[PDB]
Amino acid sequence: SLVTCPICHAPYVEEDLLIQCRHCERWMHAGCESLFTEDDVEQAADEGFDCVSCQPYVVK
């Protein structure tokens, strides 16, 4: 993490909005996580944030 995102396995320049799944402690781009606004991630973060991995594993 902090350099490679699982959704988009590629390097990036420290920029754009950042959001990290607390369950996995993984950093990833807000855009690749469906986040398009700072406000939306604010509320999402407040209610907790689940990465793409958590959704399928959490729900069976």
């Binding site: 950042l18 991630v41 973060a45 907790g48």
Partner: peptide, 9 residues
């Protein structure tokens, strides 16, 4: 901590 962890940049 409470909720997810996100930063601005």
């Amino acid at each position: 901590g409470v909720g997810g962890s996100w930063g601005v940049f």
